[PDB]
Design a binder for this molecule. Sequence first.
Ligand SMILES: c1ccc(Nc2nc(Nc3ccccc3)n3nccc3n2)cc1
Length: 328
Amino acid sequence: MSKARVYADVNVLRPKEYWDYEALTVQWGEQDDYEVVRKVGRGKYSEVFEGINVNNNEKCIIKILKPVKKKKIKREIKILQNLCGGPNIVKLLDIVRDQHSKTPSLIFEYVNNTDFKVLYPTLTDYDIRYYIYELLKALDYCHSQGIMHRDVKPHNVMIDHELRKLRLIDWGLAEFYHPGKEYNVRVASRYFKGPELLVDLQDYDYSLDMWSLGCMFAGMIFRKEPFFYGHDNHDQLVKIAKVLGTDGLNAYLNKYRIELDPQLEALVGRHSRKPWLKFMNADNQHLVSPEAIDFLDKLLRYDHQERLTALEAMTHPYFQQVRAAENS
Ligand SMILES: c1ccc(Nc2nc(Nc3ccccc3)n3nccc3n2)cc1
């Protein structure tokens, strides 16, 4: 019977209309107000384009959604409206649809991002602390509003390196947290899927996002994209096991009385825990300081209940200089 250690009662205390996204009655804006300038991104659920608001002539992001259930689209919209205005949360400006096809488009404030594959390698030690801290504000905020992002990964973190601005995007897989609720484990992207999803523990919570963040963080400091490189869901768990060790996994499975699929349990085998320093090399030496390791260690824990909360992560000494600069 797992439950969140923090913000567990957020949706319990708020009006049913706050979290009842299926009751939402979408108020469609004007399709023609926004025009496509250039394609900038794509995914299995949508196509993204840099656009222009014909009225004010300012930039915008046009996320054209691929065919999907009415329920899922109202969910992303409700979540975007509830989070609009929060620290580093992408800002939903409008919602429109194509009359004939009914193809919906979500309009967002613009963010001039820089592909992480090219950006990350140039980030300095301080840049990593700064940006991870900013991403942390976004997670503590959405969690405090009773929402799990469920798809934290580089591609969903827009970074304008010039203006040092950060935005957490694509809430298409986000969901409201309800104590005891059993959620679908088919969320997030494989490399950032936490153990809970890989072993079918359905009653997960905000902590799922912290494992994902931890994967991102580990990839940045160790300069290894992605950190846990698995080919399918089974292999994803195996790559994690060979690092954290199988004792921790077995302890985890016993705590939540979970039985691993015979096949999976066979693939995982048995592995000793590998110290985080064995991943250091001349390419990442200038980033793997002791504070970084202590911090990463507290994020990548099998037991989702053991992981630091977004709020705790922000106070870790690792971010001490980022906080000091902010409070100046
Ligand atoms: C991959 C890339 C972008 C998105 N969506 C996406 N892209 C951007 N900005 C952007 C601009 C230029 C190049 C890349 C991103 N933004 N900016 C705000 C929201 C958003 N969503 C989705 C997947």
